[PDB]
Every structure is written in structure tokens, then in C-alpha cells.
Amino acid sequence: FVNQHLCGSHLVEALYLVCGERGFFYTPKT
Amino acid sequence: GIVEQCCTSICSLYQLENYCN
């Protein structure tokens, strides 16, 4: 696998691409 | 959470896989 800086819409897109149509829930700053 | 760990720091795709449904 790989690792990066990912923020906002790009973080939500990367998460969606890792998970596929199964879906997800991101955790906030804290 | 990942809005800090992926953005302010670095994260992996293997770490994003923990936050899938």
C-alpha cells in the first residue's frame, strides 16, 4: 500500500476509493 | 481523527480501510 497527505474532498474521495460502494464514516480533527 | 491524521500529518490507504462501513 501507499501513504500521503490527504485533506477535505480529497480525503473523502480517497476514503470512498479505498472502501468502494460499501461506504464509510470519517473521524474529525480530535 | 483522520481529518487531522491524514491532512496535518500523513496516513495510509490501509489506515483509511479502518473507517469503511
Side-chain angles (χ1 to χ4, degrees):
Chain A
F1 58 79
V2 298
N3 58 268
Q4 287 293 273
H5 284 275
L6 290 168
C7 299
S9 305
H10 312 119
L11 177 57
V12 170
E13 187 173 84
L15 181 57
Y16 177 61
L17 288 170
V18 167
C19 302
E21 295 181 277
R22 181 162 58 113
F24 61 86
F25 179 79
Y26 65 88
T27 50
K29 189 184 296 182
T30 307
Chain B
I2 63 173
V3 168
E4 186 178 84
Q5 182 60 61
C6 291
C7 183
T8 306
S9 194
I10 286 180
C11 79
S12 71
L13 301 186
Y14 179 77
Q15 285 171 324
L16 292 178
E17 198 178 272
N18 182 73
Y19 297 95
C20 306
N21 182 253

Short mmCIF file of all heavy atoms in Angstrom, two decimals:
data_model
loop_
_atom_site.label_atom_id
_atom_site.label_comp_id
_atom_site.label_asym_id
_atom_site.label_seq_id
_atom_site.Cartn_x
_atom_site.Cartn_y
_atom_site.Cartn_z
N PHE A 1 0.84 -1.23 0.00
CA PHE A 1 0.00 0.00 0.00
C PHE A 1 0.87 1.27 0.00
O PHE A 1 2.09 1.17 0.08
CB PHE A 1 -1.03 -0.03 1.16
CG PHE A 1 -0.45 -0.15 2.56
CD1 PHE A 1 0.09 0.98 3.21
CD2 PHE A 1 -0.47 -1.39 3.22
CE1 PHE A 1 0.61 0.86 4.51
CE2 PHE A 1 0.04 -1.51 4.53
CZ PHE A 1 0.58 -0.38 5.17
N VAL A 2 0.26 2.46 -0.09
CA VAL A 2 0.94 3.78 -0.07
C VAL A 2 0.38 4.70 1.02
O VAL A 2 -0.66 4.40 1.63
CB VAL A 2 0.88 4.48 -1.46
CG1 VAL A 2 1.62 3.66 -2.53
CG2 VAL A 2 -0.55 4.78 -1.93
N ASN A 3 1.06 5.83 1.26
CA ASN A 3 0.72 6.84 2.27
C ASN A 3 0.98 8.27 1.78
O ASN A 3 1.93 8.50 1.02
CB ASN A 3 1.46 6.52 3.58
CG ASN A 3 2.98 6.46 3.43
OD1 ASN A 3 3.55 5.40 3.19
ND2 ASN A 3 3.69 7.57 3.56
N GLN A 4 0.15 9.24 2.18
CA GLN A 4 0.09 10.60 1.63
C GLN A 4 -0.45 11.62 2.66
O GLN A 4 -1.04 11.25 3.67
CB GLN A 4 -0.82 10.61 0.38
CG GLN A 4 -0.27 9.96 -0.89
CD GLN A 4 0.92 10.71 -1.49
OE1 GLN A 4 0.77 11.64 -2.28
NE2 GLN A 4 2.14 10.37 -1.13
N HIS A 5 -0.32 12.91 2.34
CA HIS A 5 -1.19 13.96 2.87
C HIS A 5 -2.49 14.02 2.04
O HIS A 5 -2.45 14.11 0.81
CB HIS A 5 -0.49 15.34 2.82
CG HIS A 5 0.56 15.56 3.88
ND1 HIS A 5 0.35 15.99 5.16
CD2 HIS A 5 1.92 15.48 3.70
CE1 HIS A 5 1.54 16.17 5.75
NE2 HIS A 5 2.54 15.88 4.89
N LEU A 6 -3.64 13.98 2.71
CA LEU A 6 -4.99 13.97 2.14
C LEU A 6 -5.92 14.82 3.01
O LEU A 6 -6.02 14.58 4.21
CB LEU A 6 -5.49 12.51 2.08
CG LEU A 6 -4.80 11.59 1.04
CD1 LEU A 6 -5.20 10.14 1.31
CD2 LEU A 6 -5.19 11.98 -0.39
N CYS A 7 -6.60 15.81 2.42
CA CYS A 7 -7.43 16.79 3.12
C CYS A 7 -8.80 16.95 2.45
O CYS A 7 -8.90 16.91 1.22
CB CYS A 7 -6.71 18.15 3.12
SG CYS A 7 -5.09 18.21 3.93
N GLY A 8 -9.84 17.16 3.25
CA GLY A 8 -11.18 17.58 2.81
C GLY A 8 -11.80 16.66 1.75
O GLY A 8 -11.94 15.46 1.96
N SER A 9 -12.15 17.22 0.60
CA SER A 9 -12.76 16.49 -0.52
C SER A 9 -11.83 15.39 -1.05
O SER A 9 -12.29 14.32 -1.43
CB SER A 9 -13.12 17.45 -1.66
OG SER A 9 -13.95 18.52 -1.20
N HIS A 10 -10.52 15.61 -1.02
CA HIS A 10 -9.52 14.64 -1.47
C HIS A 10 -9.39 13.47 -0.47
O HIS A 10 -9.28 12.31 -0.89
CB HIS A 10 -8.18 15.36 -1.65
CG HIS A 10 -8.27 16.64 -2.45
ND1 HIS A 10 -7.96 17.91 -2.01
CD2 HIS A 10 -8.76 16.78 -3.73
CE1 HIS A 10 -8.24 18.78 -2.99
NE2 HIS A 10 -8.73 18.14 -4.07
N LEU A 11 -9.48 13.75 0.83
CA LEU A 11 -9.58 12.73 1.89
C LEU A 11 -10.86 11.90 1.74
O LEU A 11 -10.80 10.68 1.75
CB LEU A 11 -9.48 13.42 3.26
CG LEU A 11 -9.63 12.48 4.48
CD1 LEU A 11 -8.60 11.35 4.46
CD2 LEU A 11 -9.46 13.31 5.77
N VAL A 12 -12.01 12.56 1.56
CA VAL A 12 -13.31 11.88 1.38
C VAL A 12 -13.35 11.04 0.10
O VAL A 12 -13.88 9.93 0.11
CB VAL A 12 -14.48 12.91 1.44
CG1 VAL A 12 -15.83 12.32 1.02
CG2 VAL A 12 -14.63 13.46 2.87
N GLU A 13 -12.73 11.52 -0.99
CA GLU A 13 -12.58 10.77 -2.24
C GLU A 13 -11.66 9.55 -2.07
O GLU A 13 -12.03 8.45 -2.48
CB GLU A 13 -12.04 11.71 -3.33
CG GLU A 13 -12.00 11.06 -4.72
CD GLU A 13 -11.63 12.08 -5.80
OE1 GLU A 13 -10.42 12.34 -6.01
OE2 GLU A 13 -12.55 12.63 -6.46
N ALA A 14 -10.49 9.72 -1.45
CA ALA A 14 -9.56 8.61 -1.20
C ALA A 14 -10.19 7.52 -0.32
O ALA A 14 -10.11 6.33 -0.65
CB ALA A 14 -8.28 9.18 -0.57
N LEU A 15 -10.88 7.92 0.75
CA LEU A 15 -11.63 7.02 1.63
C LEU A 15 -12.70 6.25 0.84
O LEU A 15 -12.71 5.03 0.86
CB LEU A 15 -12.21 7.87 2.79
CG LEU A 15 -13.01 7.09 3.84
CD1 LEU A 15 -12.21 5.95 4.50
CD2 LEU A 15 -13.46 8.07 4.93
N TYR A 16 -13.53 6.95 0.06
CA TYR A 16 -14.51 6.31 -0.82
C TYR A 16 -13.88 5.32 -1.82
O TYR A 16 -14.43 4.24 -2.05
CB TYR A 16 -15.33 7.38 -1.56
CG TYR A 16 -16.33 6.79 -2.55
CD1 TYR A 16 -17.36 5.94 -2.09
CD2 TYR A 16 -16.19 7.03 -3.93
CE1 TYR A 16 -18.24 5.34 -3.00
CE2 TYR A 16 -17.08 6.43 -4.85
CZ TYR A 16 -18.10 5.58 -4.38
OH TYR A 16 -18.95 4.99 -5.27
N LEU A 17 -12.71 5.64 -2.38
CA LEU A 17 -11.99 4.77 -3.32
C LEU A 17 -11.38 3.54 -2.63
O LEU A 17 -11.35 2.46 -3.23
CB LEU A 17 -10.92 5.59 -4.07
CG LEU A 17 -11.48 6.57 -5.12
CD1 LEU A 17 -10.35 7.49 -5.60
CD2 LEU A 17 -12.07 5.83 -6.34
N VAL A 18 -10.94 3.67 -1.38
CA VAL A 18 -10.48 2.54 -0.54
C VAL A 18 -11.66 1.61 -0.18
O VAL A 18 -11.52 0.39 -0.24
CB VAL A 18 -9.76 3.04 0.73
CG1 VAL A 18 -9.53 1.94 1.79
CG2 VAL A 18 -8.38 3.61 0.36
N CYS A 19 -12.81 2.18 0.19
CA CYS A 19 -13.96 1.42 0.69
C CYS A 19 -14.86 0.85 -0.41
O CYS A 19 -15.51 -0.18 -0.20
CB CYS A 19 -14.79 2.33 1.61
SG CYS A 19 -13.85 2.98 3.02
N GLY A 20 -14.93 1.51 -1.57
CA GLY A 20 -15.87 1.21 -2.65
C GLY A 20 -17.31 1.59 -2.28
O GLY A 20 -17.54 2.39 -1.38
N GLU A 21 -18.28 1.00 -2.98
CA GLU A 21 -19.72 1.24 -2.78
C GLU A 21 -20.25 0.82 -1.39
O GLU A 21 -21.38 1.17 -1.02
CB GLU A 21 -20.52 0.53 -3.89
CG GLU A 21 -20.24 1.10 -5.29
CD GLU A 21 -21.09 0.37 -6.35
OE1 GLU A 21 -20.68 -0.72 -6.81
OE2 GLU A 21 -22.17 0.88 -6.73
N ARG A 22 -19.45 0.09 -0.60
CA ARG A 22 -19.73 -0.27 0.80
C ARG A 22 -19.96 0.95 1.71
O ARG A 22 -20.75 0.87 2.65
CB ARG A 22 -18.57 -1.14 1.30
CG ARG A 22 -18.71 -1.63 2.75
CD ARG A 22 -17.79 -2.81 3.06
NE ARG A 22 -16.36 -2.52 2.82
CZ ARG A 22 -15.41 -2.43 3.74
NH1 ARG A 22 -15.66 -2.39 5.03
NH2 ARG A 22 -14.15 -2.36 3.36
N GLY A 23 -19.30 2.08 1.42
CA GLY A 23 -19.41 3.33 2.20
C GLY A 23 -18.45 3.40 3.40
O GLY A 23 -17.62 2.52 3.61
N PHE A 24 -18.57 4.49 4.17
CA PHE A 24 -17.57 4.93 5.15
C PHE A 24 -18.13 5.96 6.15
O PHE A 24 -19.23 6.49 5.98
CB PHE A 24 -16.38 5.53 4.38
CG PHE A 24 -16.73 6.75 3.54
CD1 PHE A 24 -16.75 8.03 4.11
CD2 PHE A 24 -17.10 6.59 2.18
CE1 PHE A 24 -17.14 9.15 3.35
CE2 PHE A 24 -17.52 7.70 1.43
CZ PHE A 24 -17.54 8.98 2.01
N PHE A 25 -17.32 6.29 7.16
CA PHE A 25 -17.50 7.43 8.06
C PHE A 25 -16.14 7.94 8.56
O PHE A 25 -15.44 7.25 9.30
CB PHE A 25 -18.42 7.04 9.23
CG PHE A 25 -18.64 8.16 10.23
CD1 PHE A 25 -19.56 9.19 9.93
CD2 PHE A 25 -17.91 8.20 11.43
CE1 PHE A 25 -19.76 10.24 10.84
CE2 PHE A 25 -18.10 9.26 12.33
CZ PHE A 25 -19.03 10.28 12.04
N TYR A 26 -15.75 9.15 8.15
CA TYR A 26 -14.51 9.80 8.59
C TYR A 26 -14.62 10.40 10.00
O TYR A 26 -15.67 10.92 10.40
CB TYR A 26 -14.12 10.87 7.55
CG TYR A 26 -15.08 12.05 7.40
CD1 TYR A 26 -14.93 13.19 8.22
CD2 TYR A 26 -16.11 12.00 6.44
CE1 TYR A 26 -15.82 14.27 8.08
CE2 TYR A 26 -17.00 13.08 6.30
CZ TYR A 26 -16.85 14.23 7.12
OH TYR A 26 -17.71 15.28 6.99
N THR A 27 -13.51 10.36 10.76
CA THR A 27 -13.39 10.99 12.08
C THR A 27 -12.78 12.40 11.97
O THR A 27 -11.89 12.61 11.14
CB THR A 27 -12.58 10.11 13.04
OG1 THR A 27 -11.38 9.71 12.42
CG2 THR A 27 -13.38 8.86 13.42
N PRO A 28 -13.26 13.37 12.78
CA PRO A 28 -12.89 14.78 12.71
C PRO A 28 -11.48 15.03 13.26
O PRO A 28 -10.72 14.10 13.51
CB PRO A 28 -13.99 15.51 13.50
CG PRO A 28 -14.35 14.51 14.58
CD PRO A 28 -14.27 13.18 13.83
N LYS A 29 -11.10 16.30 13.42
CA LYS A 29 -9.76 16.71 13.87
C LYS A 29 -9.34 16.01 15.18
O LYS A 29 -8.33 15.31 15.20
CB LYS A 29 -9.74 18.25 13.97
CG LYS A 29 -8.33 18.81 14.22
CD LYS A 29 -8.30 20.33 14.43
CE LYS A 29 -8.76 21.09 13.17
NZ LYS A 29 -8.69 22.57 13.38
N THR A 30 -10.16 16.13 16.23
CA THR A 30 -9.97 15.46 17.54
C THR A 30 -10.57 14.05 17.53
O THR A 30 -9.78 13.09 17.43
CB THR A 30 -10.58 16.30 18.68
OG1 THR A 30 -10.06 17.62 18.61
CG2 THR A 30 -10.23 15.75 20.06
N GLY B 1 -8.61 12.34 14.98
CA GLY B 1 -9.21 11.52 13.91
C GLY B 1 -8.56 11.80 12.57
O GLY B 1 -7.60 12.56 12.49
N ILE B 2 -9.05 11.20 11.48
CA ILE B 2 -8.37 11.24 10.17
C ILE B 2 -8.36 12.61 9.51
O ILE B 2 -7.41 12.91 8.79
CB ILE B 2 -8.85 10.13 9.20
CG1 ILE B 2 -10.34 10.23 8.82
CG2 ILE B 2 -8.49 8.76 9.80
CD1 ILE B 2 -10.73 9.22 7.73
N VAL B 3 -9.31 13.49 9.82
CA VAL B 3 -9.26 14.90 9.37
C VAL B 3 -8.02 15.65 9.91
O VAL B 3 -7.59 16.62 9.29
CB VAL B 3 -10.59 15.62 9.70
CG1 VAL B 3 -10.57 17.15 9.56
CG2 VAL B 3 -11.72 15.08 8.80
N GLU B 4 -7.39 15.19 11.00
CA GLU B 4 -6.04 15.61 11.40
C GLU B 4 -4.96 14.64 10.88
O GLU B 4 -4.00 15.08 10.24
CB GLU B 4 -5.96 15.74 12.93
CG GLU B 4 -4.62 16.31 13.41
CD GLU B 4 -4.59 16.47 14.94
OE1 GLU B 4 -4.28 15.47 15.64
OE2 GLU B 4 -4.84 17.59 15.44
N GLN B 5 -5.09 13.33 11.15
CA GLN B 5 -4.02 12.35 10.91
C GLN B 5 -3.67 12.20 9.43
O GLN B 5 -2.50 11.98 9.12
CB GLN B 5 -4.41 10.99 11.53
CG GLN B 5 -3.34 9.89 11.38
CD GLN B 5 -2.01 10.24 12.04
OE1 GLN B 5 -1.91 10.45 13.25
NE2 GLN B 5 -0.92 10.32 11.30
N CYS B 6 -4.63 12.33 8.51
CA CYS B 6 -4.35 12.27 7.07
C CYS B 6 -3.94 13.62 6.48
O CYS B 6 -3.24 13.64 5.47
CB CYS B 6 -5.59 11.76 6.34
SG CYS B 6 -6.00 10.02 6.62
N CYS B 7 -4.39 14.74 7.06
CA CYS B 7 -4.22 16.07 6.48
C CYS B 7 -3.01 16.82 7.07
O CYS B 7 -2.08 17.17 6.33
CB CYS B 7 -5.52 16.86 6.65
SG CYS B 7 -5.51 18.51 5.91
N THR B 8 -3.03 17.05 8.38
CA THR B 8 -1.98 17.76 9.14
C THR B 8 -0.75 16.89 9.28
O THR B 8 0.37 17.36 9.10
CB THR B 8 -2.53 18.17 10.52
OG1 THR B 8 -3.73 18.90 10.33
CG2 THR B 8 -1.56 19.07 11.29
N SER B 9 -0.95 15.60 9.56
CA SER B 9 0.08 14.56 9.42
C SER B 9 -0.12 13.73 8.13
O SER B 9 -0.83 14.16 7.22
CB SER B 9 0.11 13.72 10.71
OG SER B 9 1.29 12.92 10.78
N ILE B 10 0.50 12.55 8.03
CA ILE B 10 0.36 11.59 6.92
C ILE B 10 -0.43 10.36 7.38
O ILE B 10 -0.26 9.89 8.51
CB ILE B 10 1.76 11.22 6.38
CG1 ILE B 10 2.30 12.42 5.57
CG2 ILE B 10 1.78 9.92 5.54
CD1 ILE B 10 3.69 12.20 4.95
N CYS B 11 -1.24 9.79 6.48
CA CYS B 11 -1.88 8.48 6.69
C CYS B 11 -1.75 7.56 5.47
O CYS B 11 -1.44 7.99 4.36
CB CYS B 11 -3.35 8.67 7.08
SG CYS B 11 -4.48 9.05 5.72
N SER B 12 -2.00 6.27 5.67
CA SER B 12 -2.00 5.24 4.62
C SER B 12 -3.41 4.84 4.15
O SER B 12 -4.41 5.03 4.86
CB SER B 12 -1.23 4.00 5.10
OG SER B 12 -1.95 3.29 6.10
N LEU B 13 -3.50 4.21 2.97
CA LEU B 13 -4.74 3.60 2.48
C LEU B 13 -5.21 2.46 3.40
O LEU B 13 -6.41 2.28 3.63
CB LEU B 13 -4.52 3.09 1.05
CG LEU B 13 -4.08 4.14 0.01
CD1 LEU B 13 -4.06 3.49 -1.38
CD2 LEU B 13 -4.98 5.39 -0.02
N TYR B 14 -4.27 1.72 3.99
CA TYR B 14 -4.55 0.69 5.00
C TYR B 14 -5.16 1.26 6.29
O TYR B 14 -6.01 0.62 6.91
CB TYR B 14 -3.24 -0.07 5.28
CG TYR B 14 -3.35 -1.17 6.32
CD1 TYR B 14 -3.94 -2.40 5.98
CD2 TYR B 14 -2.88 -0.96 7.63
CE1 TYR B 14 -4.06 -3.42 6.94
CE2 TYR B 14 -2.99 -1.97 8.59
CZ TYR B 14 -3.57 -3.21 8.25
OH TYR B 14 -3.68 -4.20 9.19
N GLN B 15 -4.80 2.49 6.67
CA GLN B 15 -5.44 3.22 7.76
C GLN B 15 -6.83 3.74 7.37
O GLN B 15 -7.74 3.62 8.18
CB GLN B 15 -4.54 4.37 8.23
CG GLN B 15 -3.35 3.86 9.06
CD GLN B 15 -2.32 4.96 9.36
OE1 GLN B 15 -2.07 5.84 8.55
NE2 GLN B 15 -1.69 4.96 10.52
N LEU B 16 -7.03 4.23 6.14
CA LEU B 16 -8.37 4.61 5.65
C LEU B 16 -9.35 3.42 5.65
O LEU B 16 -10.53 3.61 5.94
CB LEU B 16 -8.26 5.22 4.23
CG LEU B 16 -7.57 6.59 4.15
CD1 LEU B 16 -7.49 7.03 2.68
CD2 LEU B 16 -8.29 7.67 4.97
N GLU B 17 -8.87 2.20 5.38
CA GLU B 17 -9.69 0.98 5.38
C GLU B 17 -10.36 0.69 6.74
O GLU B 17 -11.42 0.06 6.79
CB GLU B 17 -8.82 -0.20 4.91
CG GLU B 17 -9.65 -1.40 4.44
CD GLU B 17 -8.73 -2.53 3.92
OE1 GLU B 17 -8.38 -2.53 2.72
OE2 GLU B 17 -8.38 -3.43 4.72
N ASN B 18 -9.80 1.18 7.85
CA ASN B 18 -10.40 1.08 9.18
C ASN B 18 -11.72 1.88 9.31
O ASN B 18 -12.58 1.55 10.14
CB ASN B 18 -9.37 1.58 10.21
CG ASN B 18 -9.88 1.48 11.65
OD1 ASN B 18 -9.99 0.41 12.22
ND2 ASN B 18 -10.20 2.61 12.27
N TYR B 19 -11.90 2.93 8.49
CA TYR B 19 -13.04 3.86 8.55
C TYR B 19 -14.14 3.56 7.51
O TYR B 19 -15.15 4.27 7.44
CB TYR B 19 -12.46 5.28 8.42
CG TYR B 19 -11.56 5.63 9.59
CD1 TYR B 19 -10.17 5.45 9.48
CD2 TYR B 19 -12.12 6.03 10.82
CE1 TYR B 19 -9.33 5.65 10.59
CE2 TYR B 19 -11.28 6.25 11.93
CZ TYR B 19 -9.88 6.06 11.82
OH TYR B 19 -9.08 6.27 12.90
N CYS B 20 -13.99 2.49 6.74
CA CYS B 20 -15.07 1.90 5.94
C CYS B 20 -16.21 1.32 6.81
O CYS B 20 -16.01 0.97 7.97
CB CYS B 20 -14.49 0.81 5.02
SG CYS B 20 -13.13 1.34 3.96
N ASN B 21 -17.41 1.20 6.22
CA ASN B 21 -18.60 0.63 6.87
C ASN B 21 -18.47 -0.89 7.16
O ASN B 21 -18.82 -1.31 8.28
CB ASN B 21 -19.83 0.94 5.99
CG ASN B 21 -21.14 0.44 6.59
OD1 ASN B 21 -21.73 -0.53 6.14
ND2 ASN B 21 -21.63 1.08 7.63
#
